[PDB]
């Protein structure tokens, strides 16, 4: 089926600029208490999620240098250690992961 007549711009504006087609304003945007960057109420902060992944990748790179190959997953717990720290009383019989960097403030030692 082919158009019988050309649709005019006046008809087109009513369809293209209809409120349904228009982008809806979002009212769920709030500032992150930690860094001040913008975030949504039901979504984790992009800036705060990126810093965790940057630190996680470095930790996972240290794991690779200790395992030294695939199919070598340890059967014990893992502990991440930074400069200026010693294994805890509960951190006995676990795999200590050394990081040559100061412990991040948001990363609480447990």
């Amino acid at each position: 089926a082919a158009p019988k007549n050309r649709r005019t711009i006046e008809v087109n504006r009513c369809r293209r600029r209809n409120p349904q087609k228009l982008i809806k304003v979002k009212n769920n945007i709030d500032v992150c208490p930690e860094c001040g960057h913008l975030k949504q109420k039901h979504v984790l902060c992009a800036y705060c999620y990126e810093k965790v992944c940057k630190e996680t990748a470095e930790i996972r790179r240290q794991i690779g240098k200790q395992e030294g190959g695939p199919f070598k997953a340890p059967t014990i717990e893992t502990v991440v250690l930074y400069t200026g720290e010693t294994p805890s009383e509960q951190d006995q019989g676990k795999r200590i992961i050394e990081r040559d960097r100061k412990r991040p403030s948001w990363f609480t030692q447990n």
């Binding site: 984790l44 999620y49 930790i59 070598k72 997953a73 717990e77 948001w106 990363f107």
Partner: protein
């Protein structure tokens, strides 16, 4: 008409759906925290909770070993399930994993989410925190609670 359907339609079929979740489940056990589309994380979350339930049955249980054998593609993670994850949640009866939403990826603007096993050694996620008890709204409700309890005592 889809009433009562709980399982989603993913992959290239019912079998490919299992393999997609099996890869996510296997990748979740090895790393204890992965990022994946929200729908696939939510569908895999049920299998992640029940995998620990089979892990608490012990490696001496033949049925529990077969579930671990199938749902863990990499065979080095099977000893980890029965010796690390299962002992960790010994006191717990549920809520082994937490699922949180993350900003949509730039590739296709897909709804993304992160699923992790509780108690991992990875840096903590910026978990959503409720307002402190010292806020103005909480203080008015705290004062109301005290009077109701005090009047209840007398």
């Amino acid at each position: 008409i889809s009433h009562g359907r709980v399982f989603r339609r993913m992959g290239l079929g019912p079998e490919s759906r299992i393999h997609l979740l099996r890869n996510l489940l296997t990748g979740l056990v090895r790393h204890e925290r992965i990022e994946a589309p929200w729908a696939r994380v939510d569908e895999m979350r049920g299998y992640a909770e029940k995998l620990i339930d089979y892990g608490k049955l012990g490696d001496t249980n033949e049925r529990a070993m077969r579930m671990a054998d199938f749902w863990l593609t990499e065979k080095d993670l099977i000893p980890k399930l029965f010796q690390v994850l299962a002992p960790r949640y010994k006191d717990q009866t549920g809520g082994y994993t937490r699922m949180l939403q993350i900003p949509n990826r730039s590739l296709d603007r897909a709804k993304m989410a992160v699923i992790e096993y509780k108690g991992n050694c990875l840096p903590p996620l910026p978990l959503p925190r409720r307002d402190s008890h010292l806020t103005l709204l909480n203080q008015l409700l705290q004062g109301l609670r005290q009077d109701l309890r005090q009047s209840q005592e007398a």
